[PDB]
Every structure is written in C-alpha cells, then in structure tokens.
Amino acid sequence: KSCHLEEEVSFEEKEMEKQRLLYQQSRLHTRGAAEM
Helix, strand or coil: CCCCCCCCCCCHHHHHHHHHHHHHHHCCHHHCCCCC
C-alpha cells in the first residue's frame, strides 16, 4: 500500500502521477524487491 497512492484530467498531471508511481516503484525494486 505504499505505492498505490497515485494509482476531465490533463496531460502533464497524469504523466506526473504515473512517473511518481514509477519513482515510488524504483524506490523499492532497485534493491532486490522484484526478486524477493
């Protein structure tokens, strides 16, 4: 539940929240969380 916080809107706010999700997922899986 740490990473589902961002999961008639515009372009950059929705791309902003999807790469906020990508940053919060590279928060974890850059240290073995994808193979744990």
